[PDB]
Amino acid sequence: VKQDMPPVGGYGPIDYKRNLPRRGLSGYSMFAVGIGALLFGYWSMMRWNRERRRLQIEDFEARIALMP
Amino acid sequence: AMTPFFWMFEEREKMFEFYERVSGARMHAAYVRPGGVHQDLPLGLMDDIYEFS
Structure with missing residues (x-):
């Protein structure tokens, strides 16, 4: 008997494809998301800084009423 | 570029x-x-070349 190494009928394919799924996000939308979250941070920044200025004026009033 | 060197050295x-x-x-x-x-x-070689391919 002869027991060489042939392939059995022909093997399957091996892909030579360039895999580029191009994800993605449509970057003008990413500009929109970044500017939106950035402006939301600005509004929160405004609100907290002005409430803390109210409290810091209360600290001023404490030292003024405590001075003499 | 240190790491893809080692990925393709695993293949090699x-x-x-x-x-x-x-x-x-x-x-x-x-x-x-x-x-x-x-x-x-x-x-027992050609099937392994197929998997490697």
């Missing part, structure tokens, strides 16, 4: 493993007489 380690299984050598498989390939490939 399978390459060196194939040369080991064919002739024995890690790198310096002489293996080729003028007059065709000597000491031919054993049974």
Whole structure:
């Protein structure tokens, strides 16, 4: 008997494809998301800084009423 | 660019493993007489080349 190494009928394919799924996000939308979250941070920044200025004026009033 | 070097060296380690299984050598498989390939490939190689491909 002869027991060489042939392939059995022909093997399957091996892909030579360039895999580029191009994800993605449509970057003008990413500009929109970044500017939106950035402006939301600005509004929160405004609100907290002005409430803390109210409290810091209360600290001023404490030292003024405590001075003499 | 340190890491893709090592990824493709893992693949080239399978390459060196194939040369080991064919002739024995890690790198310096002489293996080729003028007059065709000597000491031919054993049974159980082509399927492994297929998986590697």
